[PDB]
Amino acid sequence: YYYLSVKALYTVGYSTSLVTLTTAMVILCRFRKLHCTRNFIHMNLFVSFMLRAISVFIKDWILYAEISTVECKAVMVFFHYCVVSNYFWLFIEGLYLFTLLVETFFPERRYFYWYTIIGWGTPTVCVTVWATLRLYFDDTGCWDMNDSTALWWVIKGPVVGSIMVNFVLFIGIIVILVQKLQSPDSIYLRLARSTLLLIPLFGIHYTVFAFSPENVSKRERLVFELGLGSFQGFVVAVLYCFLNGEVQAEIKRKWRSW
Amino acid sequence: HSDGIFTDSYSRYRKQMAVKKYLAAVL
Amino acid sequence: SIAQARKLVEQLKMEANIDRIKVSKAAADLMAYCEAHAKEDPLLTPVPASENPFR
Amino acid sequence: QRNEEKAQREANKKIEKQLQKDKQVYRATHRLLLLGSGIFETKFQVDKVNFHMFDVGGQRDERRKWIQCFNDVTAIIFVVANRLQEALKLFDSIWNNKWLRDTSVILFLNKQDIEDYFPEFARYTTPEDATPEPGEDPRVTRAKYFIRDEFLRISTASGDGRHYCYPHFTNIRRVFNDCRDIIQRMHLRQYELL
Amino acid sequence: QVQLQESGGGLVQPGGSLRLSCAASGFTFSNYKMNWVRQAPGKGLEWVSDISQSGASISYTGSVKGRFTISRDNAKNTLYLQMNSLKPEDTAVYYCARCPAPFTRDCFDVTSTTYAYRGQGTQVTV
Amino acid sequence: ELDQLRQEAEQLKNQIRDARKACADATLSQITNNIDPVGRIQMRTRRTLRGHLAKIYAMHWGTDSRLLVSASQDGKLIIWDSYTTNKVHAIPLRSSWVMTCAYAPSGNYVACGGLDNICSIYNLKTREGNVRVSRELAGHTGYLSCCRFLDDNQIVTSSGDTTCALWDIETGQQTTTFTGHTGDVMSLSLAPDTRLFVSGACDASAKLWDVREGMCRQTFTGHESDINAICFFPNGNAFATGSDDATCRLFDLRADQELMTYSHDNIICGITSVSFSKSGRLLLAGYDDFNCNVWDALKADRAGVLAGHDNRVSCLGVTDDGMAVATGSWDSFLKIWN
């Protein structure tokens, strides 16, 4: 069918975005020269991606063998967490670079400590409110149906919320970046190259189908946001961990040291 | 989100193949 | 100058009267020092992890 | 002995608390080398941003050694006054120094109302994009922009984007805005996007 | 011992032509960017020319462009300065300076005679 | 008078040259060729001291081989316990640009100077228990590149105005002023008996002084560029230098000439720090590149590297007992290698 055509597509996306991000997480941790306050934002993003790929391999197995167990009710809470926490570490990372360009001077630098409270803390707030709302209003099976749209907007709310905000922060960076290009200090070629770098890191491909009803076009919404959208963790790794002049130098220098 | 829509659609699909098959045998 | 150029004369004359020994005698005392202290060099010889305080 | 090592590990604990209250004030202040009792510090503040400008006063005119100290500095403020060819040959050394290869150079040019030292000035016409401020002839504008194009011949011949020159004509507001452009271009370069 | 003993120079009529040599010793001549500086009577030192260690990367000051020509012979450890069309105000003591560190592109050779890797000078009167 | 006075000194300096050529009868390498090599000497970072905001410039071991003082561009002077990694003191400085630091042989004082031309002496063992500056030796007209304690009262300082100076801390005025260098003096090193001390400057010349008489005994000219670091052989009858020429050389006080050079074609970075092992067999040399080499000071063959700093190695020092080799770098981290 079509569903097993997507389910067998992102399990390859979530898999190649798991052997690549772990390899990316190792390089970021092993080499100590690559220990910045921005590589800690990336490390928290890389873990949120791996938490998303892991929680889906468990979710599909529990929901589909491939009975309404309480272990369902505890794996959906872990599934709606390791996914909402990924739409927030894409937003936090866009908010971090936006606070590196805007508010350049007197950087409080406690923002990074407040970012962990938002990346890993706000999902716990929005999931628990969703979880404790299912046991009181609509408790149907493993609650994988999400028929109650009022209770579904408790999860889709913060998720879509961190996509309209992570978009205006993407434009604000593009506006600021082009001013660095407009100044006299191939302009379309590198601005386009830079835009193709900020798209996987900020999750701008989620802006295409966000704020769109689920029913209007769903067969293409899932092959785009899940089929090739699950390869975002793999693209984010090879673009930002690998293929990076600062990171590539470390393997090079530690190669001649060997 | 994007995964909460596939599980909504695929779980409702498997449930539809279970009710529409059980109702097909008895009818 | 003429003043600073005269210092270069009173100094080269003072450095030219020193006693210089042959390097076959002055270099045979450097190795001969590295042969009487080779046992007390924790970097040259492997130190046991008991005496090593940086274990 | 375990007790004095506890008192020692508490002194390391009071020290590391002070090294953290100093790491915040160190990252907040931006160092600035003012090139041209062994060193004079000027502490000005623009928009609640602490700037520390360090004039090397009592140092000798041999800079190949004490200039390496100012590589982590935000920008090297370079005031220009054959006093001009000497500054072009000095800027060419500050630019092509391995240590200062990542250090931007804000550059100021004092000029008032050039052919004997530079013969290409008899063949140089001011570019049309040059905006002269009203109050002086268009001839010094041809001179103000010739020197500016003489420092940009060095600023552009080398440097793959690690450091940038910011020439000006003659305050602290221009150093403030130029320091913001220096850090912003540094953050964009770290993200490998430019 | 870094010794830069130059030659040439003397008295020539305005419009003549000299050739300042520079016999360098005590260092690997092919690693350092050589220079030429002069001290006009009554004024500080000013930079005249230079040449990179590669052999062909040359710069001059504005007042000697087209008239002077620097050239080095790494196989002989010698630095030349072919002076042509000597103006009356081009009279000075010409020093054969050397940039401090090897394999670099920056130099600090005009330093109030306190520079160590420099020559004694040759008088050029016009 | 300069007509003859400048040219006869060329003959005077020439009759010094062949006198050194009359002593050279067998190179150090030929004499040490028979000695069996040390193979490969692989040290590994035992401790990594952290907490310096800016690049470290100088460190100096204490005589007890346990404590060490490191000076950083952040303006903080920190004393560390290389054993327990703990920080003993965190002395804040007035001028942030300190290019040198010293540890008194009695552990009571530490010195530091830099672009402020002042040599501040900090009293550790005070009556109030804290640490504060005791004296500010202000007599130099250039930056301070080195500082070495002879006693708790006599400190010899190398400055960037081409002059070294012997001081008296109880008074604060120069007991002696050593002149003779033509470039800014970059490093000095006291002799094991502290009666003489060599000194390297930016004129590719190393001068052997005499602390008591205040004169210059010998002058060694073998390098080709600015001598950045100097260190006495533990015997006291030799010393090693490190210049921007990307080479290290072992001079000899009794032979007045250079004995051996430590260079390789792969290294073009200038040596920024030189030290000897306790036996004087190894010559640990820091470089502009992060890696620090280890030279067999008798065979001039390399015998190891310490490539862990990831930044230019500002300083380097072996303990008096020869246990550890603390190396400091612009990376802001001081690593102990055993």
mmCIF file with all atom_site columns, N, CA and C in Angstrom, chain E residues 50-95:
data_model
loop_
_atom_site.group_PDB
_atom_site.id
_atom_site.type_symbol
_atom_site.label_atom_id
_atom_site.label_alt_id
_atom_site.label_comp_id
_atom_site.label_asym_id
_atom_site.label_entity_id
_atom_site.label_seq_id
_atom_site.pdbx_PDB_ins_code
_atom_site.Cartn_x
_atom_site.Cartn_y
_atom_site.Cartn_z
_atom_site.occupancy
_atom_site.B_iso_or_equiv
_atom_site.pdbx_formal_charge
_atom_site.auth_seq_id
_atom_site.auth_comp_id
_atom_site.auth_asym_id
_atom_site.auth_atom_id
_atom_site.pdbx_PDB_model_num
ATOM 1   N N  . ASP E 1 50 ? 61.684 46.442 -2.304  1.00 0.00 ? 50 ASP E N  1
ATOM 2   C CA . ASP E 1 50 ? 61.837 45.122 -1.708  1.00 0.00 ? 50 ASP E CA 1
ATOM 3   C C  . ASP E 1 50 ? 61.622 44.082 -2.794  1.00 0.00 ? 50 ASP E C  1
ATOM 4   N N  . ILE E 1 51 ? 61.779 42.819 -2.413  1.00 0.00 ? 51 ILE E N  1
ATOM 5   C CA . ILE E 1 51 ? 61.589 41.711 -3.340  1.00 0.00 ? 51 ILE E CA 1
ATOM 6   C C  . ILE E 1 51 ? 61.381 40.449 -2.518  1.00 0.00 ? 51 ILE E C  1
ATOM 7   N N  . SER E 1 52 ? 60.398 39.647 -2.917  1.00 0.00 ? 52 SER E N  1
ATOM 8   C CA . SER E 1 52 ? 60.077 38.461 -2.145  1.00 0.00 ? 52 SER E CA 1
ATOM 9   C C  . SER E 1 52 ? 61.133 37.384 -2.363  1.00 0.00 ? 52 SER E C  1
ATOM 10  N N  . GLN E 1 53 ? 61.107 36.377 -1.490  1.00 0.00 ? 53 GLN E N  1
ATOM 11  C CA . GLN E 1 53 ? 62.071 35.289 -1.578  1.00 0.00 ? 53 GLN E CA 1
ATOM 12  C C  . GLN E 1 53 ? 61.863 34.437 -2.820  1.00 0.00 ? 53 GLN E C  1
ATOM 13  N N  . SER E 1 54 ? 60.669 34.483 -3.415  1.00 0.00 ? 54 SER E N  1
ATOM 14  C CA . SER E 1 54 ? 60.409 33.730 -4.636  1.00 0.00 ? 54 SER E CA 1
ATOM 15  C C  . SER E 1 54 ? 61.337 34.171 -5.758  1.00 0.00 ? 54 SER E C  1
ATOM 16  N N  . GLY E 1 55 ? 61.577 35.472 -5.869  1.00 0.00 ? 55 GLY E N  1
ATOM 17  C CA . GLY E 1 55 ? 62.429 35.998 -6.911  1.00 0.00 ? 55 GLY E CA 1
ATOM 18  C C  . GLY E 1 55 ? 61.726 37.060 -7.726  1.00 0.00 ? 55 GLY E C  1
ATOM 19  N N  . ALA E 1 56 ? 60.420 36.885 -7.948  1.00 0.00 ? 56 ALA E N  1
ATOM 20  C CA . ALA E 1 56 ? 59.615 37.843 -8.708  1.00 0.00 ? 56 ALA E CA 1
ATOM 21  C C  . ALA E 1 56 ? 58.367 38.185 -7.899  1.00 0.00 ? 56 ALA E C  1
ATOM 22  N N  . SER E 1 57 ? 58.526 39.125 -6.967  1.00 0.00 ? 57 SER E N  1
ATOM 23  C CA . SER E 1 57 ? 57.396 39.824 -6.358  1.00 0.00 ? 57 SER E CA 1
ATOM 24  C C  . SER E 1 57 ? 57.977 41.123 -5.806  1.00 0.00 ? 57 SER E C  1
ATOM 25  N N  . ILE E 1 58 ? 57.798 42.208 -6.545  1.00 0.00 ? 58 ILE E N  1
ATOM 26  C CA . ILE E 1 58 ? 58.572 43.425 -6.355  1.00 0.00 ? 58 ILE E CA 1
ATOM 27  C C  . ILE E 1 58 ? 57.634 44.576 -6.030  1.00 0.00 ? 58 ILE E C  1
ATOM 28  N N  . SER E 1 59 ? 58.079 45.460 -5.141  1.00 0.00 ? 59 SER E N  1
ATOM 29  C CA . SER E 1 59 ? 57.349 46.673 -4.815  1.00 0.00 ? 59 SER E CA 1
ATOM 30  C C  . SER E 1 59 ? 58.337 47.821 -4.697  1.00 0.00 ? 59 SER E C  1
ATOM 31  N N  . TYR E 1 60 ? 57.874 49.024 -5.025  1.00 0.00 ? 60 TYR E N  1
ATOM 32  C CA . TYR E 1 60 ? 58.681 50.226 -4.911  1.00 0.00 ? 60 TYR E CA 1
ATOM 33  C C  . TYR E 1 60 ? 57.892 51.301 -4.185  1.00 0.00 ? 60 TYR E C  1
ATOM 34  N N  . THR E 1 61 ? 58.604 52.332 -3.744  1.00 0.00 ? 61 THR E N  1
ATOM 35  C CA . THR E 1 61 ? 57.932 53.536 -3.299  1.00 0.00 ? 61 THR E CA 1
ATOM 36  C C  . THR E 1 61 ? 57.579 54.391 -4.512  1.00 0.00 ? 61 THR E C  1
ATOM 37  N N  . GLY E 1 62 ? 56.598 55.275 -4.328  1.00 0.00 ? 62 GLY E N  1
ATOM 38  C CA . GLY E 1 62 ? 56.073 56.024 -5.457  1.00 0.00 ? 62 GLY E CA 1
ATOM 39  C C  . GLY E 1 62 ? 57.119 56.842 -6.187  1.00 0.00 ? 62 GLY E C  1
ATOM 40  N N  . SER E 1 63 ? 58.132 57.323 -5.472  1.00 0.00 ? 63 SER E N  1
ATOM 41  C CA . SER E 1 63 ? 59.093 58.246 -6.058  1.00 0.00 ? 63 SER E CA 1
ATOM 42  C C  . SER E 1 63 ? 60.224 57.558 -6.813  1.00 0.00 ? 63 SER E C  1
ATOM 43  N N  . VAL E 1 64 ? 60.260 56.227 -6.854  1.00 0.00 ? 64 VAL E N  1
ATOM 44  C CA . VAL E 1 64 ? 61.342 55.532 -7.544  1.00 0.00 ? 64 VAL E CA 1
ATOM 45  C C  . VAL E 1 64 ? 60.768 54.577 -8.581  1.00 0.00 ? 64 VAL E C  1
ATOM 46  N N  . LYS E 1 65 ? 59.452 54.609 -8.766  1.00 0.00 ? 65 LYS E N  1
ATOM 47  C CA . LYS E 1 65 ? 58.810 53.718 -9.724  1.00 0.00 ? 65 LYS E CA 1
ATOM 48  C C  . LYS E 1 65 ? 59.270 54.041 -11.138 1.00 0.00 ? 65 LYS E C  1
ATOM 49  N N  . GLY E 1 66 ? 59.695 53.011 -11.868 1.00 0.00 ? 66 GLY E N  1
ATOM 50  C CA . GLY E 1 66 ? 60.179 53.154 -13.219 1.00 0.00 ? 66 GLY E CA 1
ATOM 51  C C  . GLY E 1 66 ? 61.652 53.487 -13.327 1.00 0.00 ? 66 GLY E C  1
ATOM 52  N N  . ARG E 1 67 ? 62.213 54.154 -12.320 1.00 0.00 ? 67 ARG E N  1
ATOM 53  C CA . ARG E 1 67 ? 63.615 54.551 -12.342 1.00 0.00 ? 67 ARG E CA 1
ATOM 54  C C  . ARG E 1 67 ? 64.523 53.518 -11.686 1.00 0.00 ? 67 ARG E C  1
ATOM 55  N N  . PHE E 1 68 ? 64.129 52.986 -10.535 1.00 0.00 ? 68 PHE E N  1
ATOM 56  C CA . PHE E 1 68 ? 64.917 51.995 -9.819  1.00 0.00 ? 68 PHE E CA 1
ATOM 57  C C  . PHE E 1 68 ? 64.431 50.589 -10.150 1.00 0.00 ? 68 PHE E C  1
ATOM 58  N N  . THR E 1 69 ? 65.316 49.617 -9.942  1.00 0.00 ? 69 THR E N  1
ATOM 59  C CA . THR E 1 69 ? 65.001 48.219 -10.220 1.00 0.00 ? 69 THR E CA 1
ATOM 60  C C  . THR E 1 69 ? 65.780 47.339 -9.256  1.00 0.00 ? 69 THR E C  1
ATOM 61  N N  . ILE E 1 70 ? 65.066 46.568 -8.443  1.00 0.00 ? 70 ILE E N  1
ATOM 62  C CA . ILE E 1 70 ? 65.677 45.645 -7.497  1.00 0.00 ? 70 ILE E CA 1
ATOM 63  C C  . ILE E 1 70 ? 65.727 44.262 -8.127  1.00 0.00 ? 70 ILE E C  1
ATOM 64  N N  . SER E 1 71 ? 66.771 43.509 -7.797  1.00 0.00 ? 71 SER E N  1
ATOM 65  C CA . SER E 1 71 ? 66.938 42.163 -8.320  1.00 0.00 ? 71 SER E CA 1
ATOM 66  C C  . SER E 1 71 ? 67.914 41.412 -7.430  1.00 0.00 ? 71 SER E C  1
ATOM 67  N N  . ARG E 1 72 ? 67.587 40.160 -7.125  1.00 0.00 ? 72 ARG E N  1
ATOM 68  C CA . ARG E 1 72 ? 68.395 39.335 -6.242  1.00 0.00 ? 72 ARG E CA 1
ATOM 69  C C  . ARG E 1 72 ? 68.847 38.075 -6.965  1.00 0.00 ? 72 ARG E C  1
ATOM 70  N N  . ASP E 1 73 ? 70.035 37.603 -6.605  1.00 0.00 ? 73 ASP E N  1
ATOM 71  C CA . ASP E 1 73 ? 70.614 36.386 -7.166  1.00 0.00 ? 73 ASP E CA 1
ATOM 72  C C  . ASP E 1 73 ? 70.797 35.395 -6.020  1.00 0.00 ? 73 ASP E C  1
ATOM 73  N N  . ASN E 1 74 ? 69.807 34.520 -5.828  1.00 0.00 ? 74 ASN E N  1
ATOM 74  C CA . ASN E 1 74 ? 69.849 33.591 -4.704  1.00 0.00 ? 74 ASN E CA 1
ATOM 75  C C  . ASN E 1 74 ? 71.005 32.607 -4.823  1.00 0.00 ? 74 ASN E C  1
ATOM 76  N N  . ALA E 1 75 ? 71.417 32.277 -6.047  1.00 0.00 ? 75 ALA E N  1
ATOM 77  C CA . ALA E 1 75 ? 72.542 31.371 -6.236  1.00 0.00 ? 75 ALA E CA 1
ATOM 78  C C  . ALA E 1 75 ? 73.872 31.998 -5.845  1.00 0.00 ? 75 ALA E C  1
ATOM 79  N N  . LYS E 1 76 ? 73.911 33.311 -5.623  1.00 0.00 ? 76 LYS E N  1
ATOM 80  C CA . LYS E 1 76 ? 75.126 33.997 -5.218  1.00 0.00 ? 76 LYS E CA 1
ATOM 81  C C  . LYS E 1 76 ? 74.964 34.764 -3.914  1.00 0.00 ? 76 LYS E C  1
ATOM 82  N N  . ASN E 1 77 ? 73.753 34.818 -3.354  1.00 0.00 ? 77 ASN E N  1
ATOM 83  C CA . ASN E 1 77 ? 73.471 35.551 -2.123  1.00 0.00 ? 77 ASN E CA 1
ATOM 84  C C  . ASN E 1 77 ? 73.831 37.028 -2.285  1.00 0.00 ? 77 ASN E C  1
ATOM 85  N N  . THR E 1 78 ? 73.222 37.650 -3.290  1.00 0.00 ? 78 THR E N  1
ATOM 86  C CA . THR E 1 78 ? 73.496 39.041 -3.615  1.00 0.00 ? 78 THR E CA 1
ATOM 87  C C  . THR E 1 78 ? 72.193 39.743 -3.957  1.00 0.00 ? 78 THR E C  1
ATOM 88  N N  . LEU E 1 79 ? 72.068 40.989 -3.511  1.00 0.00 ? 79 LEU E N  1
ATOM 89  C CA . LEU E 1 79 ? 70.904 41.819 -3.787  1.00 0.00 ? 79 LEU E CA 1
ATOM 90  C C  . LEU E 1 79 ? 71.363 43.086 -4.490  1.00 0.00 ? 79 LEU E C  1
ATOM 91  N N  . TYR E 1 80 ? 70.726 43.407 -5.611  1.00 0.00 ? 80 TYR E N  1
ATOM 92  C CA . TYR E 1 80 ? 71.112 44.546 -6.428  1.00 0.00 ? 80 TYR E CA 1
ATOM 93  C C  . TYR E 1 80 ? 70.028 45.615 -6.412  1.00 0.00 ? 80 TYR E C  1
ATOM 94  N N  . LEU E 1 81 ? 70.427 46.828 -6.790  1.00 0.00 ? 81 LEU E N  1
ATOM 95  C CA . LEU E 1 81 ? 69.483 47.928 -6.988  1.00 0.00 ? 81 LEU E CA 1
ATOM 96  C C  . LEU E 1 81 ? 70.008 48.759 -8.154  1.00 0.00 ? 81 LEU E C  1
ATOM 97  N N  . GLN E 1 82 ? 69.490 48.493 -9.349  1.00 0.00 ? 82 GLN E N  1
ATOM 98  C CA . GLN E 1 82 ? 69.881 49.237 -10.543 1.00 0.00 ? 82 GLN E CA 1
ATOM 99  C C  . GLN E 1 82 ? 69.184 50.589 -10.511 1.00 0.00 ? 82 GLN E C  1
ATOM 100 N N  . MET E 1 83 ? 69.934 51.632 -10.170 1.00 0.00 ? 83 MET E N  1
ATOM 101 C CA . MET E 1 83 ? 69.392 52.980 -10.088 1.00 0.00 ? 83 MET E CA 1
ATOM 102 C C  . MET E 1 83 ? 69.594 53.695 -11.417 1.00 0.00 ? 83 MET E C  1
ATOM 103 N N  . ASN E 1 84 ? 68.526 54.301 -11.928 1.00 0.00 ? 84 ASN E N  1
ATOM 104 C CA . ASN E 1 84 ? 68.566 55.018 -13.193 1.00 0.00 ? 84 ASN E CA 1
ATOM 105 C C  . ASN E 1 84 ? 67.838 56.344 -13.039 1.00 0.00 ? 84 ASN E C  1
ATOM 106 N N  . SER E 1 85 ? 68.294 57.344 -13.794 1.00 0.00 ? 85 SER E N  1
ATOM 107 C CA . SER E 1 85 ? 67.701 58.681 -13.790 1.00 0.00 ? 85 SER E CA 1
ATOM 108 C C  . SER E 1 85 ? 67.692 59.267 -12.377 1.00 0.00 ? 85 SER E C  1
ATOM 109 N N  . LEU E 1 86 ? 68.894 59.462 -11.841 1.00 0.00 ? 86 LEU E N  1
ATOM 110 C CA . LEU E 1 86 ? 69.045 59.894 -10.458 1.00 0.00 ? 86 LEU E CA 1
ATOM 111 C C  . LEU E 1 86 ? 68.649 61.358 -10.310 1.00 0.00 ? 86 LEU E C  1
ATOM 112 N N  . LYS E 1 87 ? 67.630 61.612 -9.498  1.00 0.00 ? 87 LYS E N  1
ATOM 113 C CA . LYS E 1 87 ? 67.203 62.965 -9.193  1.00 0.00 ? 87 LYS E CA 1
ATOM 114 C C  . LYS E 1 87 ? 68.071 63.553 -8.086  1.00 0.00 ? 87 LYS E C  1
ATOM 115 N N  . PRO E 1 88 ? 68.154 64.883 -7.995  1.00 0.00 ? 88 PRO E N  1
ATOM 116 C CA . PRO E 1 88 ? 69.000 65.484 -6.951  1.00 0.00 ? 88 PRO E CA 1
ATOM 117 C C  . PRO E 1 88 ? 68.518 65.201 -5.540  1.00 0.00 ? 88 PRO E C  1
ATOM 118 N N  . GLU E 1 89 ? 67.214 65.042 -5.334  1.00 0.00 ? 89 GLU E N  1
ATOM 119 C CA . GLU E 1 89 ? 66.676 64.767 -4.008  1.00 0.00 ? 89 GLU E CA 1
ATOM 120 C C  . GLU E 1 89 ? 66.710 63.287 -3.651  1.00 0.00 ? 89 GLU E C  1
ATOM 121 N N  . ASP E 1 90 ? 67.236 62.438 -4.532  1.00 0.00 ? 90 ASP E N  1
ATOM 122 C CA . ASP E 1 90 ? 67.403 61.021 -4.248  1.00 0.00 ? 90 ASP E CA 1
ATOM 123 C C  . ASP E 1 90 ? 68.778 60.701 -3.681  1.00 0.00 ? 90 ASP E C  1
ATOM 124 N N  . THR E 1 91 ? 69.425 61.667 -3.036  1.00 0.00 ? 91 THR E N  1
ATOM 125 C CA . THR E 1 91 ? 70.703 61.438 -2.380  1.00 0.00 ? 91 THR E CA 1
ATOM 126 C C  . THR E 1 91 ? 70.467 61.060 -0.922  1.00 0.00 ? 91 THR E C  1
ATOM 127 N N  . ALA E 1 92 ? 71.063 59.950 -0.503  1.00 0.00 ? 92 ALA E N  1
ATOM 128 C CA . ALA E 1 92 ? 70.843 59.397 0.827   1.00 0.00 ? 92 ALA E CA 1
ATOM 129 C C  . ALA E 1 92 ? 71.843 58.268 1.040   1.00 0.00 ? 92 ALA E C  1
ATOM 130 N N  . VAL E 1 93 ? 71.777 57.658 2.217   1.00 0.00 ? 93 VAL E N  1
ATOM 131 C CA . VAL E 1 93 ? 72.584 56.493 2.555   1.00 0.00 ? 93 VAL E CA 1
ATOM 132 C C  . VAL E 1 93 ? 71.690 55.271 2.389   1.00 0.00 ? 93 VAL E C  1
ATOM 133 N N  . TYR E 1 94 ? 72.024 54.406 1.437   1.00 0.00 ? 94 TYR E N  1
ATOM 134 C CA . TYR E 1 94 ? 71.167 53.283 1.077   1.00 0.00 ? 94 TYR E CA 1
ATOM 135 C C  . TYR E 1 94 ? 71.576 52.038 1.854   1.00 0.00 ? 94 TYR E C  1
ATOM 136 N N  . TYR E 1 95 ? 70.665 51.535 2.682   1.00 0.00 ? 95 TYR E N  1
ATOM 137 C CA . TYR E 1 95 ? 70.883 50.336 3.474   1.00 0.00 ? 95 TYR E CA 1
ATOM 138 C C  . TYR E 1 95 ? 70.214 49.136 2.818   1.00 0.00 ? 95 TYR E C  1
#
